[PDB]
Every structure is written in C-alpha cells, then in structure tokens.
Amino acid sequence: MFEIKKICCIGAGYVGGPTCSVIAHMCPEIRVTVVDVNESRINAWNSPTLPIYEPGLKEVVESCRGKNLFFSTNIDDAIKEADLVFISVNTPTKTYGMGKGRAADLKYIEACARRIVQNSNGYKIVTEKSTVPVRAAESIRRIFDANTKPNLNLQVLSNPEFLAEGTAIKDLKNPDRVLIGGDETPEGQRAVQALCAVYEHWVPREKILTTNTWSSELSKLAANAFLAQRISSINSISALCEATGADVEEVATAIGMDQRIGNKFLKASVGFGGSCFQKDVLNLVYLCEALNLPEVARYWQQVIDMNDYQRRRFASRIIDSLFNTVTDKKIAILGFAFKKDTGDTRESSSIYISKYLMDEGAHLHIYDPKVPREQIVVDLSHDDQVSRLVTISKDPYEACDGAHAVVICTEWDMFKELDYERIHKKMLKPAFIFDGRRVLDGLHNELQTIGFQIETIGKKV
Amino acid sequence: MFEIKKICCIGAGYVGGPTCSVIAHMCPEIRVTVVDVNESRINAWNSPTLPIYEPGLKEVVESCRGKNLFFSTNIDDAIKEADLVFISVNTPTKTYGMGKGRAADLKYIEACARRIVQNSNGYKIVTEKSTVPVRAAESIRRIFDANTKPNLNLQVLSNPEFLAEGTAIKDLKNPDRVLIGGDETPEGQRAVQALCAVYEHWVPREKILTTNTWSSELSKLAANAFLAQRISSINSISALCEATGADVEEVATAIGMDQRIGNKFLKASVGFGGSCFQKDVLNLVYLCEALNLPEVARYWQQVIDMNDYQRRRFASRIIDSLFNTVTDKKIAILGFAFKKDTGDTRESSSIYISKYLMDEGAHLHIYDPKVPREQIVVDLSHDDQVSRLVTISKDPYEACDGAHAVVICTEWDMFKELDYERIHKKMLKPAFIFDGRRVLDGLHNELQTIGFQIETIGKKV
Amino acid sequence: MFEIKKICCIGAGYVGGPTCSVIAHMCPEIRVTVVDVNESRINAWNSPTLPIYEPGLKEVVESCRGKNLFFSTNIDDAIKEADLVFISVNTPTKTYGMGKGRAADLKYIEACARRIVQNSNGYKIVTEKSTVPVRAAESIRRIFDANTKPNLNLQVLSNPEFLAEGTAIKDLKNPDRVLIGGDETPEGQRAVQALCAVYEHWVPREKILTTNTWSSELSKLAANAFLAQRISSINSISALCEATGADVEEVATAIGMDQRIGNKFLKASVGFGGSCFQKDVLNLVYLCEALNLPEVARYWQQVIDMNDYQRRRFASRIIDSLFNTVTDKKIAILGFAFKKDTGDTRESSSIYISKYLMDEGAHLHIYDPKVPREQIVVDLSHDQVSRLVTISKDPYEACDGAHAVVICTEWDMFKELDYERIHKKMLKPAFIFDGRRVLDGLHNELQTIGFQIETIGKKV
Ligand SMILES: NC(=O)c1ccc[n+]([C@@H]2O[C@H](COP(=O)([O-])OP(=O)(O)OC[C@H]3O[C@@H](n4cnc5c(N)ncnc54)[C@H](O)[C@@H]3O)[C@@H](O)[C@H]2O)c1
Ligand SMILES: NC(=O)c1ccc[n+]([C@@H]2O[C@H](COP(=O)([O-])OP(=O)(O)OC[C@H]3O[C@@H](n4cnc5c(N)ncnc54)[C@H](O)[C@@H]3O)[C@@H](O)[C@H]2O)c1
Ligand SMILES: O=C(O)[C@H]1O[C@H](OP(=O)(O)OP(=O)(O)OC[C@H]2O[C@@H](n3ccc(=O)[nH]c3=O)[C@H](O)[C@@H]2O)[C@H](O)[C@@H](O)[C@@H]1O
Ligand SMILES: O=C(O)[C@H]1O[C@H](OP(=O)(O)OP(=O)(O)OC[C@H]2O[C@@H](n3ccc(=O)[nH]c3=O)[C@H](O)[C@@H]2O)[C@H](O)[C@@H](O)[C@@H]1O
Ligand SMILES: O=C(O)[C@H]1O[C@H](OP(=O)(O)OP(=O)(O)OC[C@H]2O[C@@H](n3ccc(=O)[nH]c3=O)[C@H](O)[C@@H]2O)[C@H](O)[C@@H](O)[C@@H]1O
Ligand SMILES: [Cl-]
Ligand SMILES: [Cl-]
Ligand SMILES: [Cl-]
Ligand SMILES: [Cl-]
C-alpha cells in the first residue's frame, strides 16, 4: 500500500484552505501545502487575519500552520514534492464565448493540469476536487497521456467537496460522506485506496463512498441541483401561500415531517445565493443540451428560473408597497452576505435586490456584520451610480435612520434582536419592513403595534 | 448600327478593372477608361503593383494600359466623352436603417446615375453591371427622364457580371455566357445590339443571351442564390455524414455523377465567403418580403442560415475538441482569403472562425500567402482585442510553433504540402488539425501516425 | 477473384424485376432468379403480360426468361443457391407510431434479413437494392451476427437504384453511374469487387463508383433531395418573376448556361410529384431530426414547403381570378398524371389542385389521355367526388360550359387543342391557367381569341 506523506493543493480559496487545514489537523504526519497564484490571499492565510471568515477556521489554521500546514505562492516546488495534488480552483460560469451564462469555465483547471505535468516526475495522485462538468477528468488524463516522461505515473481521481460555507469546519471534521471516484484499473484502485487512507485518519470507512470517476463528478452536480431544487420548490410554495392565506412555514413543517421528504432545506427566502448552486445547475443544463437531453435541461432550468422569479417579485413587492416609486427614497438593506456566518457575497440575493432598487434610483444604506465595505462597493459596481445611490452603514440603526423601508436579505441572528421601537421613531412614515428570511416571525403583532407595515415571504398581506 | 468607340466604367474594383482590361485587350479600337473616387486605388491600377491580386490580370493591364486602357479619378470627363457608361460600383448590404442586415444599399448606384445625367449630352448607353435588386434600372430611367436636356438620349441596359475572383481573366475571356437586358423598344433594342457588338469581338454570338431588363437583373441574383445553395446543401450533408459515418466527398461524387445535378459546387467547407453570395441572397430575401412573398423569402434564407450553422459548429468543434476551453491557447489560422488565388477577404469564413475563437480569448497566429497583414488587422478589428489576441505570421511554421491546433480555412495548395512532422514536434500536446477545406484528405493516416488528432468536415471522428 | 454465378433477388417489384432482367440479359453466364411472396405477381412475370409496364422490359425479359432469368415463389432454394442475394423489397412510409408520415418502415427488409440468414450456409454477398434509411445495412449485419453459424460469411453491400419512371430500361442499360457501398475491410472489398464485375459486363468501369456503405445509402436520398431542390428553387423564382415582370423561362436559360449550375431540372411547374421525391425528402428530414440535426432538418423541409406553396398559390390564383367564388363553377382539369407520358398519379400536383378546388365547391371535369378514370376517383376520394367530380372522355367535353381550363400535366396534345372551339363554348370571362408552361408561344393568339391567360413565372 502506498502512503501519501506530502499533499499539495492548488487553490487556496473557501475549499482549499479549510479542506487542507482539516487534513493537516487530523493527519499530523502529512505535510500539507496550499498554493495559489494570488499573493495577497496567500499572505493573508499566513497572517492574523485570514482572507475568509469561517467559524472555527482560525483555530484550526493556527494549530497546524508552520508545523504541517503551509501556504505558499511557490506552486512548482509544492507540486514537485507532492505525493498527492488536489485541484481546488474556481470553476465559474463563462461570461463570454460559447455557452456564455451557462457553460462551466474550465480554464483554471486546464492551467493546473498543464502545470502539474510540467513540474511532475515519478508517481503522483492528482485529485479533482473542483466541481466540474462530467468527464472533465478524461481531459486531465488526455493531457497527461500526451505529455508523458519516463517513469511519470500520474493517476487521476475525482474527490468532490460537500462543505457549506458558514459550517465548513464542522462539515469537514464530521462529513455525512466522503466521495472518491477513479477508474477500475489496478493503478486506479491503488490511487483510490491511498486517498481513502488519508480520510480514514478521521472519517469512518462506512462514510467513504468509492465509485467510478464519472458517477463521482455527476454526484456533486446532482447533489447541488437537488439542494437548490428543494429551496426553489419551497420558494414556489411561498408564492402560493401569499395568494391563499396558507403560511409557508406551516406548510414546510407539514411536508418535512414526511420522513421520505425530510425537514431540511425548506426555509423560504428572497432567493438562494452563494458561488455554486446557480452555476452548477447551469453547468448541468448546458451539459444536457450538449448531450442532446433538452427535456432534462429544461427540468433543471426551472430551479434557476424560480430563484430569479422569487427575487424579482420580492423587489417588485418593495416598489409596489412604497406607492409604486422608490426614486430618492432611503432604504435600509440589512444583510449582504449570501447566508449567515460567512463574509462571502458571491451571488448573494442582496446584490440582486440592491441592483433592482438602484435601477429605480433608491438610496440604499447597507449594513452587514461581516462583509467588508469594499466588497459591497465592488459587487454593486458595473461606479457613478454606486457613488450616487449606495451608502455602507456602520450599524443597522444608522441604516434605518430616515429610511422608508427596512429590507432583510440575510438571516443574521442580530436582526430579530434589534430595537424596532427606536427604529420606527426615526423612520419616514409610513414605515415598512420587508423580511426576505422569515427571521421576524412571531414579532409581527408587536411590529404592527409599533406602527410598521410588516411583509414577509410566504405570508399573505 | 451604332458603334461604341469610347467606354467609361465607374467603379475600378474587382469587377470594373478586370472587365475593362479584358474589353480593351479584345477590342483594340475601343478606348476604355476606368474611373473611381478612390485615388489610391486608381494610382495602384497605374502602378507596378495592382490593387488586387488576380491571376493573369497584370499581364492584361500591362498590354493595354496607356494605349486603349486608362485608369483615372477624372470621372466627369470620362463620362462626358463616353458612348457607353458601365455602372460597376459596390452594392453592399445596408448596415443601418430600414432593412439593416438584409436590403441592398443602392446609394453608390444612385450617385452614379446623378453624376451621369449631370455630365452627359447626346446619345449614351448606360449599362448596369452592378448586382442590383430587380427593377433598380427603372429608378435609373426615372432619374434620367426627370432630368432631360435637349438631344440627351440615355438608354439603360442590364449587363450583370458572372466572373468569380481567382479565375476572373479566364471567366472574362471565355464566359459560359454574357447576359444583356433592355426594353423591347426600337431604341432599347438598338442599345442592346450595340453592346452585343462589343462582346462579339471575342464571345461567340450563341453565348450572348438577350432578355428584358428585369429577367436580366433577376437572373444574376438567382444564379448566385443557386450556387450558394449548392454549397449550403452539400455542407448540410457534411453534418449528416459526421453523424453517420458516411463521407461527404464520397456522397458529393455520387450525387454529382447524376448529369442533371452536375459535379460542380459540391465541395464542403467551413462556409462560403466572398463579397456577394450572402448579400445577394439577403437582397433576394428582402425583396421577396417587400413583394409579399414570405414563403420564397424563407426558402432562400435557409441558404444563409445553413452557412452560419456550418461556421459556428466548426468553431464549436475546435473549442469542444480542445477540452472545452481555448483561453490563452495558441492556435494557428492557415488561410484568411475567402478562397484560394485571391487576396480578397470579404466575408471570409476565416474572419468568422477567428472572431469566434477571439471571443474565447484564444491567441490566434494567422498566415495567408496573399492577404496583406494590414487587411487581416482591419478585418478582425471592431482594436485592443486584436493587439492582445492576434499575431500575423510570416510563414505557416511560425504560426504552428507552440500551437495547440492548426485550423485550415482557405484551400491554398501549399497547406497540404507542409512538413507536418516538423510541425508536430514544436506543437503543444495533444496536437490537433482542424481541416475546414478537405485539403488534407488522404494524409489522415500519416498525420495520425505522426500523432495529430485530425478532424475534417463531413467525416466522422 | 470471386465469380458471382447465381443471383437471387428477393422482391419482384418495380426495381427488382427490371434490374434483374437487364443483369440476366447482359450476363448470360449468371443465373438470375427473382423471387417474391406474391404468387400472382410471380406468375404474371412468366406471362405474356408482365406485372410492371416499362418500355423495353418485355423484350428484355423474353430474351432470357427460362434461359438464365427465372421468377419463382420458391424463395428458400433461390437464397440457398445464390452467390449474391439482392434485397429488393419495399420500404413504405410508416402510417403509424414513431415517424408517422415520414419514417421508412423496415419490416420487409428485416423479414428478408432473417430469412436469408436462416437459409444460408457458407459465403454469400447480400446487397441492398431498395431505397432504405441510412444505417439500415447495420441492422442487417446485426441480425446476421446474432444468428451466425459455423462457416457462415454474409457480406453486406449497398447498391441503390436510380430508375426514372418510364425510362427504367434505358436508365439500367446506360446509367449515369452505378453506386456500390461496402465496408473498407478485405472481405467487404472483395464483395464490392465481385458485384462490380457483374456491372462491368455492360457499364464502363469509370461509371461504377464504390464508397462505404453509409455514403452509398445517404447518396440515394441526397440525390433525390438535390433534384427536388432544383425544382423548388426555380418554382420559388417563378413567383418572384410574376411579381417583377421577369420571365422564369428566360431566367432558367440564363442560370442554366452556367456550367456549374447546369440546365437540367429547371422547368418551373405547379409542383413536383411522383412516389419518390416527397417520400425520400421527408425521410431525410426525419433522419436529421433523429440524429439531432435540426438545422439540417429544416433546411431540407423547405423543399417540401416550397412545393406545397407552389400548389397552394396556383389554386388560390384560380379562385381569386374567378371572383373568389367557384361554388358550382365548372372547371376543366387537363392532366392528372404526375408528369406526361404516364398513367401514374402518385403525389401528382393535379390531385392537390383538384382537392383545393373541390373544397370550394367547384365542379371539376378531369381529362387525362392515359390515367384510368378509376384511379382519378380513388385519388380524389377520402361524398364530394360523386357530387363534384366528372371524368371526361375528351378535353372538349371538359371545357364545355367551363369558366377556366387548368393545365396540370405537360401532355404534348394540350398545345394542339382547338382553343377557338373551346373559347366559344366557355363562360365569359374565360380563363386558361397553364401550370406547366406548355402554351408558351400560343399566348398572343389565345389573347386574341379572348382568353385571360395565366401561367407560372410570367404575367402574359
Ligand atoms: N465554496 C464552496 O462552499 C464550495 C463547496 C464545494 C465545492 N466547491 C467547488 O470548489 C472549487 C473552488 O471553490 P472556491 O470557493 O474555493 O473558489 P475560490 O475562488 O474562492 O478559490 C479558488 C482559488 O484558486 C486560485 N487559482 C485559480 N487558478 C489557479 C491556478 N492556475 N494556479 C493556482 N491557483 C489558481 C484562485 O486564485 C483562487 O484563490 C470550485 O470548483 C467550486 O465549485 C466550492
Ligand atoms: N467581386 C466579384 O467577384 C463580383 C462578381 C460579379 C458581380 N459583382 C458585382 O459587381 C459590383 C462591384 O463589385 P466589386 O467587387 O468590384 O466592388 P468594389 O468595392 O471592389 O469596387 C467598387 C468601386 O466603386 C467605387 N465607387 C463607389 N461609388 C462610386 C461613385 N459614386 N463614383 C465612382 N466610384 C465609386 C468604389 O470606390 C470601389 O472602388 C457589385 O455590385 C457586385 O455585387 C462582383
Ligand atoms: O458546492 C458548493 O459550493 C456547496 O453549496 C452549498 O453550500 P453553500 O452555498 O455554502 O451554503 P447553503 O447552506 O447550501 O445555502 C445556499 C443558499 O441557499 C440559501 N438557503 C439554504 C437553505 C434553505 O432552506 N433556504 C435557503 O434560502 C442560503 O441562504 C444560501 O443563499 C451546499 O450546501 C454544499 O453542500 C456544497 O458543497
Ligand atoms: O457575384 C459575384 O460576386 C460572383 O460570386 C461568385 O464568385 P466568388 O464569390 O468570387 O467565388 P466562388 O468560386 O463562387 O466561391 C464563393 C465561396 O464559395 C466557396 N465554395 C465554392 C464552391 C464550393 O464547392 N464550395 C465552397 O465552399 C468558396 O471557397 C468561396 O468562399 C460566383 O461564382 C460568380 O459567378 C459571381 O460572379
Ligand atoms: O427515387 C427514384 O426511384 C427516382 O425518383 C425520380 O424519378 P421520378 O419521380 O419517376 O421522375 P422525375 O423525372 O424525377 O419527375 C418527378 C417530378 O418532378 C417534376 N419535374 C421534373 C423536372 C423539372 O425540371 N421540373 C419538374 O416539375 C416532374 O414533372 C415530376 O412531377 C428520379 O428522377 C430518379 O433518378 C430516381 O431513381
Ligand atoms: Cl472511470
Ligand atoms: Cl449576528
Ligand atoms: Cl424592360
Ligand atoms: Cl499556395
């Protein structure tokens, strides 16, 4: 049996940093080196202020960093020395060319594959952790086959990642499962078993699934598409509730008590964000179109279409409720991160609601407890319109001071705890609360007594 | 019988220069003066370097120029002195206004008609050689009727041109036929017969067709639409072949051995280019829409739609074969002219394939034995993107050095003769050849043995 | 080199019968046995009146029948003895299920395949003679592979038919080309070569083209599609001519003089008919949809849509000319066959023009010199035939009391009619609608007699 003793991870992002940090923490005898082309990111990983906010992450980094955990921009030597190389780079939707707005952008992956074969000799396992179109591993194999050297044996595995931001460390330390894909050849199964032996330092063997390479790639896309679909489905139900007097939280509970459906991922929202759900479903759609599966393509597209309807109609709700015009109206945006317990804003609904209201010429005042203000400025920029229409607030009370509406977009715990009596006093009248997260449930009577018009998703006005 | 002794041709382009050069060469007693508003074009026609590359043209110009062949920017005196005035100006698709992207732009023609009546006295024959919408001659007539002078007799004829670039001189010296259109009046038939007498110096009378003005105008559009259609039809068959394992060259041969179909214009390609096929079919389409013939309009539109599918899918082939990403990938473009034996690039498929690959951020290195590099730069410009993504190569080996793919777009003879063993050595791996012209047929086994992945149109991978 | 000396042909129809008769006639040293399940058809091939009428066929058949040409219902013995087995059965359009109206039905081909493998030992060459969908040869190979025996070697070839109706024997004796497809293996190439040697008894080697099997199958459909496309293209041009003062006959001459275009199949018409063109183009379109080639499917669909528009617009011209009402108006239809010199009416434009006028309540009087009146009744049946349709014994009957004379088939006799006689007994205004451009050159005098003359691709 081959033993992995040095690991290199190309990509020091929300996946690469935490995954490697937990591997190093659980496997004291394995050297783990996380690398990136981004110098300031790598410099931040080596500093008292990590480049990402993830609960418990700093404690894990600090326990291992400089012992068996390293962050470096020296990609070549980290590859050269490694028994195992992870590819954990970004795979965004292409914003250009063929498949613009749908297809996965594989240029970061290809760059990794080229760099690996350029800097590799002997035996190495190359593990595709990035979320990819099905069969992407076949292209990494072809590049390696076409660029062999004497004694160079590069084995390719699929090892997709299931962590959610905000709960990364817990997800990594106690995963529901680990999935590994490789071919059925003797060398392929040897590679699989070596990677399994890494995870077995802390994951029970019954929680490690081994499949073929393509089932593993597909499983990741499917898992994300099923999760996103649960949200779009309950969000579709929120609209029906609003029209009927049914309550979406009541309905969610009823359906989720069926053990075959389950009670998770039935929290209605202004819409799902985060870097991957939309892009991974669109990748699935694009791939289906390419494989002449248009029925399957249009089935999954509904998940994205619903999410976009949820958001748009939430924005329309705000504008319709505020007498059909929001031009020059101060509006508080409470929450800019895509979910609580992260500073990540990638595809946050907060961005889409903010842009909709900015198209109207609203004056947005934006508060979030963890997102840096510079990121919010970048997200809302194409910027003159940002300088004219957007203010980043230091606290929520400042945001709401002289506002017409408070719009809650991220389910930070603090928001339900605010002093709404104080807030109502300095708001323009009538004062509105638009709750995109159902976090103010149970406060509606008190809020109404104070004087607010309170509206939320999945509840009839 | 009236005898034409002085000819003026307005338009010194790919039609006007060669047609007039051959008339002068065949009719030593007729003074032929080619005129243009473009000074540098006219200056080039008077120089050792003609403004166009056409086989055998220089020999014809040089034998007559300064004897009975003249090139001049003095349009007014050339008209004033002429027995016969040719209109041989450009008729591009309108890029603006009503019919943008479809309708013919008749502003150059109208300018000629106005200038002719302004500078004409006595008897002259005015011959519309430019490709025009049907009934355009009626407008030239109306302008003349509305601007008569005492003793001014301007007779209007249709005399469209059937030469193909690359074979212009041969086509002009030995035409399959000459077509002349005029009205059935005594003066009209007199004009027709005078123009016939010019061509009879070298074209047998049985190869000179005389029709009415509108049949003649329409015949030119129809002829071009039938030719373009043969190519789009065999290109449509190329796609079916790729899907079935049939070979398009085999199928082309089988169908073309039916004497009713004929064996010409069945060469599959990345797509037909050249200045006229697309614009003349679109003119036909537009005209049909204007005459309430939408069924006829949509029949002919298929010829353009097929051509655009052929090109797009060829580009998609390249990107799909190169692991679904070509960003930063060096790619050799061999051939930029729209067909071999011309330096003309007007509507070359090379432009469309290059632009598709540039949209992806590919690094194109472009070689062509006759197109000037300045023209390729203009064609690919909207240019920063050109400065970043495009290099004009001095030879094909330079183009292919460190390239991922060689893409053949123009059927220059030299390309099949290249040293592909040498080329494979310095290509990045795996190395691809994409043959848009079927010029490497028969070399596939040798190329595969060298190591290439070779793909071509109308052949299954 | 392998010599073929016994040929069996499964299917004694319009393709198989004549093809095999010519082979026997040209190759005296080959025994050619044509077989069929249809016993009365086989018995007719051995009779003084053959079950297929083609000029020259009777003479070819009678020259070698009983010598080296045989017709039999004994299919199993013919297969068993054959070096080469032609599959020349019909592949009719599916009238049901997947591909209804467009897909070819392969049931007969498959039956033959199963029967061949069942009755075969050793080496045989099996050749698709009938028009088939692309990759039909692969199904035959699979049936053979699944049903193999020791020493069984069945090589599958494609060898399409290019017979035009009424000229089959001349097409057979002097073909533009012979097309043979086989795979590019040693065995497939010896099979191809063995069949080439048969055709070489009368076809120059330069006119025999050998391809792969799929190329061969696809070439037959593409050929008919290119042919039908020339007709739809010149017809589309005919409509523009009428709108612009151009003449489609002048335009056809002008474009046909380009040797890259050529001068055949540019005769504008009310629309192409026949049992082949629409069927083969629709099959091609269905194959494209099945292969996920939608751009290609709708490119070729235009050939059919243009043909259908040519017929539709011609009927509407008739109706609009007769003041937009033809209820109980007598109209003479001259020509019902799909082209001249035949009684064949299959997919004839005359059917479609007649049905359009029937839908308006017109009283049609139909004359054709060769189409049997019984066929006309069937073709115009689904009620309205007995009510609206009369089959005339001569053109003058048909035109008597008529509002319009409509020429749908290009029979040479129609330009020889006594149009002064016709005009006298027609209701006024009297119309002639020439759907075939047969009365060109009578236009001046017909106008003087007093007709309103309407033709395709010209305003007279
Ligand atoms: N973020 C999540 O919650 C999550 C969860 C599961 C899976 N994933 C998948 O993991 C992958 C990475 O996600 P992420 O959120 O960490 O992205 P990220 O953008 O935050 O990090 C990727 C890093 O890779 C670097 N990189 C790109 N190309 C490089 C190259 N050629 N050489 C060296 N470094 C390079 C970038 O600079 C960046 O720092 C994606 O494919 C994603 O779909 C993400
Ligand atoms: N290029 C061919 O292979 C070809 C073949 C047959 C027919 N045609 C037809 O011939 C016509 C000309 O084609 P081309 O390729 O020679 O175009 P071109 O652009 O190369 O040449 C036309 C010339 O006319 C000049 N011109 C325009 N307006 C003028 C004016 N008012 N006074 C004086 N000069 C003027 C332009 O400066 C230009 O030099 C077109 O209508 C085209 O459809 C072209
Ligand atoms: O591939 C990925 O990137 C990851 O995507 C998600 O993780 P993540 O996007 O970080 O966070 P989630 O908790 O799944 O929520 C995504 C979006 O759905 C929203 N959401 C979630 C659950 C819910 O019930 N309702 C709802 O609106 C969240 O607020 C957020 O905007 C998946 O949960 C992970 O398993 C996966 O590894
Ligand atoms: O009006 C015009 O401008 C002229 O257009 C064409 O001439 P041209 O465009 O110069 O050259 P072609 O040989 O017709 O080819 C046009 C395009 O079709 C492509 N082509 C041609 C033939 C073929 O079989 N396959 C094919 O892809 C050529 O490479 C080229 O891109 C016609 O051939 C001329 O008769 C006509 O006078
Ligand atoms: O697939 C087949 O078995 C045969 O189909 C057709 O033969 P066919 O339909 O009998 O006769 P055609 O001469 O092609 O005429 C078909 C239709 O086209 C019409 N047509 C033909 C030529 C033309 O210029 N204009 C025109 O309207 C004819 O009047 C007729 O309605 C082909 O011509 C044969 O090569 C082929 O072998
Ligand atoms: Cl695998
Ligand atoms: Cl909080
Ligand atoms: Cl005229
Ligand atoms: Cl060359």
Curated annotation (Swiss-Prot), chains A, B:
N6-acetyllysine: residues bearing it: 107
InterPro entries recorded: 6-PGluconate_DH-like_C_sf, NAD(P)-bd_dom_sf, UDP-Glc/GDP-Man, UDP-Glc/GDP-Man_DH_C, UDP-Glc/GDP-Man_DH_C_sf, UDP-Glc/GDP-Man_DH_dimer, UDP-Glc/GDP-Man_DH_N, UDPglc_DH_euk
Molecular-function GO terms, alphabetical: identical protein binding; NAD binding; UDP-glucose 6-dehydrogenase activity
EC number(s) from the headed UniProt entry: 1.1.1.22
Activation/inhibition comment: UDP-alpha-D-xylose (UDX) acts as a feedback inhibitor. It binds at the same site as the substrate, but functions as allosteric inhibitor by triggering a conformation change that disrupts the active hexameric ring structure and gives rise to an inactive, horseshoe-shaped hexamer.
Region (Important for formation of active hexamer structure): 321-325
Free-text tissue specificity from the UniProt record: Detected in heart, placenta, liver, pancreas, spleen, thymus, prostate, ovary, small intestine and colon. Widely expressed.
UniProt pH dependence: Optimum pH is 8.6.
Documented effect of changing residue 438 to H: In DEE84; uncertain significance
Outcome of mutating residue 405 to S: In DEE84; uncertain significance
Keyword NAD: yes
List of residues binding NAD(+): 11-16, 36, 41, 89-93, 130-132, 165, 276-279, 346
Protein name: UDP-glucose 6-dehydrogenase
Record gene name: UGDH
Swiss-Prot record, chain C:
Residues annotated to bind substrate: 161-165, 220-224, 260, 267-273, 338-339, 436
Modified residues (N6-acetyllysine): 107
Pathway it works in: Nucleotide-sugar biosynthesis; UDP-alpha-D-glucuronate biosynthesis; UDP-alpha-D-glucuronate from UDP-alpha-D-glucose: step 1/1
Effect recorded for residue 82 to T: In DEE84; decreased function in glycosaminoglycan biosynthetic process in patient cells; severely decreased protein stability; decreased hexamer formation; severe decrease of UDP-glucose 6-dehydrogenase activity
Residue positions of the active site: 161 (proton donor/acceptor), 220 (proton donor/acceptor), 276 (nucleophile)
Effect on the protein upon substituting residue 104 to L: No significant effect on catalytic activity and on affinity for NAD and UDP-glucose. Decreases affinity for the inhibitor UDP-xylose. Disrupts hysteresis and cooperativity
Protein name: UDP-glucose 6-dehydrogenase
Organism annotation: Homo sapiens (Human)
